[PDB]
Amino acid sequence: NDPRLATSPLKFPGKLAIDTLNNRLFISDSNHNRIIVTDLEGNFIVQIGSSGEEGFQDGSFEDAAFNRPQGLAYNAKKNLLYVADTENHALREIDFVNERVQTLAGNGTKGSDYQGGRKGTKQLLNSPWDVCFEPVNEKVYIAMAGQHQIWEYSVLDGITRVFSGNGYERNLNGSTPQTTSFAQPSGISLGPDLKEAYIADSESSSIRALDLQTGGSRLLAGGDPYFSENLFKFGDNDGVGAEVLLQHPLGVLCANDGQIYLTDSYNHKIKKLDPVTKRVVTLAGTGKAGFKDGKVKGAQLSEPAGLAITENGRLFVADTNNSLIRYIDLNKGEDSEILTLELKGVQPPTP
Ligand code: NA
């Protein structure tokens, strides 16, 4: 209903990443098949995918093409942005020093390889949805939503292989990669000790912690902790551990203080999960899909999916179905509000 929604330059942005060294915000503008780089205030810097048209082309920023990208991760040391180019079934790399877009894995077509281990474009994928970058070991962890697996790309050898999950669509939290299953994982974010990676397990409606040394995982909140086959213990309920009900969370972000932020996407809320107490509170949203800013208990979102955070504590949200990027300044409990962040200089894909 609002005038801001009519005039958005984004169409259904899926995810977000942030460069805190250089005050840059990366927006995956999924349904325009492009990446937008703005400053932390929404002012435009540069575009990757100017056509707006679904395609699969490497090269310079103006030649390059994506197909419904979602997840973005930032390599600070090398000034690179990893892209989960979902409907190209590829992992792609935006090079900001060389103004080049390169493909790191995948070949354009959906694979059936549940094991992997090939190099570069010879290794196929299946709807990669989110990524994160482990900086000491130079690994990209991939949420393969299409095979219910977490995969691992090594920067050093160019190998993409399965990292965890046997491929059955289940909420199964074992202690090895084979004895673990995922259910449409769509968000991954590393804890601050780099030993765990928190998982937004969408079709189980759970948040899970993948062990980066063993390959097993722990159930944190949401889902049925008893029957790995029940992908229906979903709902909307705050609490601790098994009390918690979520519905199809698509995004997750771990902050440096260890606190986990998530998008309870089909509940149109944004929740915070404490990794020690397993307590989940609601940070913003009512439960009704729509657009409204202000204080968070009255405020509204529409299928949010992606988060990024500054170190002064500003939490940006890809309010996907509203096609807006929003933000909340955390830890102002009585005064907490969700604002819409206008973007200046950002315009639709030119014909
Ligand atoms: Na991510």
UniProtKB/Swiss-Prot annotation:
Function noted in UniProt: Required to maintain light harvesting efficiency, especially during nonphotochemical quenching (NPQ) recovery, via the regulation of chlorophyll excited-state lifetime probably by preventing the formation of a slowly reversible form of antenna quenching.
Residues of the full protein shown: 557 to 907 of 1055
Protein name as catalogued: Protein SUPPRESSOR OF QUENCHING 1, chloroplastic
Domain of life, source organism: Eukaryota
Family according to the record: In the N-terminal section; belongs to the HAD-like hydrolase superfamily.
Locations listed in the record: Plastid, Chloroplast thylakoid membrane
NHL repeats mapped onto the chain: 9-41, 55-91, 117-156, 246-276, 298-331
Disruption phenotype annotation: High light intensity-dependent and irreversible nonphotochemical quenching (NPQ) due to a decrease in chlorophyll excited-state lifetime.
